[PDB]
From Swiss-Prot:
Modified residues (Phosphoserine): 145
Protein name: Urokinase-type plasminogen activator chain B
Limits of the Peptidase S1 domain: 1-246
Residues carrying a glycan: 144
Entire-sequence positions represented here: 179 to 424 of 431
Effect of residue 145 to E: Abolishes phosphorylation, proadhesive function and ability to induce chemotactic response
Catalytic residue list: 46 (charge relay system), 97 (charge relay system), 198 (charge relay system)
Disulfide bonds listed in the record: 31-47, 39-110, 135-204, 167-183, 194-222
């Protein structure tokens, strides 16, 4: 997250921190995700496509920090890693950048709600906030494009939803952006998602309910003028989510 503010997991208790274990056994951060039901985390396919094997991954819930443990955190293996069969990648503009991880602990259990672990509601079909609405994004991604390290402390920021018509302008993203994607950015371009934020939540309050409107997907650099963050438009994938979570 470029700009924005530090946070703890209490302020985004559905945030899932996804890591991968290497041959060698080193564990490194991969991507963010969101808990949509006790057994299911939603994320982005591009996070996983290079390494599509479920044994490779570990999911934490209730975790506020990247490389240290948070009190009360839960650790999960990935029982099933479901990638969207219509995924594709452009130079960068991934289509259908959505993935599902069925989580279960070593003791064969799913998530147990607590002060630090909660689910996020899905939107109703094709029901998004109007353009200009302020929404929030959360992640452990870079704080500056030039950074080598990821922040040790979770971050969040606010971005405003951009209309498809605005985002499809050639000086924005042209044909790279589809109606199944959502653009969001700061009016000053001063804050944004960045590398390592992929798969994480874009959350909007829609009719008084906190809602998983988007999933961090792609962008041309970070916090650059005319170059918004791009998000998988969750309200366009409900049948896919519903079939695959059974």
């Amino acid at each position: 997250i470029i700009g924005g503010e530090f946070t703890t997991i209490e302020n985004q208790p559905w945030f899932a921190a996804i890591y991968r274990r290497h041959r060698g056994g080193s564990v490194t951060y991969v991507c963010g995700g969101s808990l949509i039901s006790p057994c299911w985390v939603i994320s982005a396919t591009h996070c996983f496509i290079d390494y599509p094997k479920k044994e490779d991954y570990i999911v934490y819930l209730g975790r506020s920090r990247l490389n240290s443990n948070t009190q009360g955190e839960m650790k999960f293996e990935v029982e099933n890693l479901i990638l969207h069969k219509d995924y594709s990648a452009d130079t960068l503009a991934h289509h259908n950048d959505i993935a599902l991880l069925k989580i279960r602990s070593k003791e064969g259990r799913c998530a147990q709600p607590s002060r630090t672990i909660q689910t996020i509601a899905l939107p109703s079909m094709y029901n998004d906030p109007q353009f200009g609405t302020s929404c929030e994004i959360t992640g452990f991604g870079k704080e500056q494009s030039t950074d080598y390290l990821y922040p040790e402390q979770l971050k969040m920021t606010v971005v405003k939803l951009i209309s498809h018509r605005e985002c499809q302008q050639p000086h924005y993203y042209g044909s790279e952006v589809t109606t199944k994607m959502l653009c969001a950015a700061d009016p000053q371009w001063k804050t944004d998602s960045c590398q390592g934020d992929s798969g994480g939540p874009l959350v909007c309050s829609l009719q008084g309910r906190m809602t998983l409107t988007g999933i961090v997907s792609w962008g041309r650099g970070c916090a650059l003028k005319d170059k918004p963050g791009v998000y998988t438009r969750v309200s366009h994938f409900l049948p896919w989510i519903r079939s695959h979570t059974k």
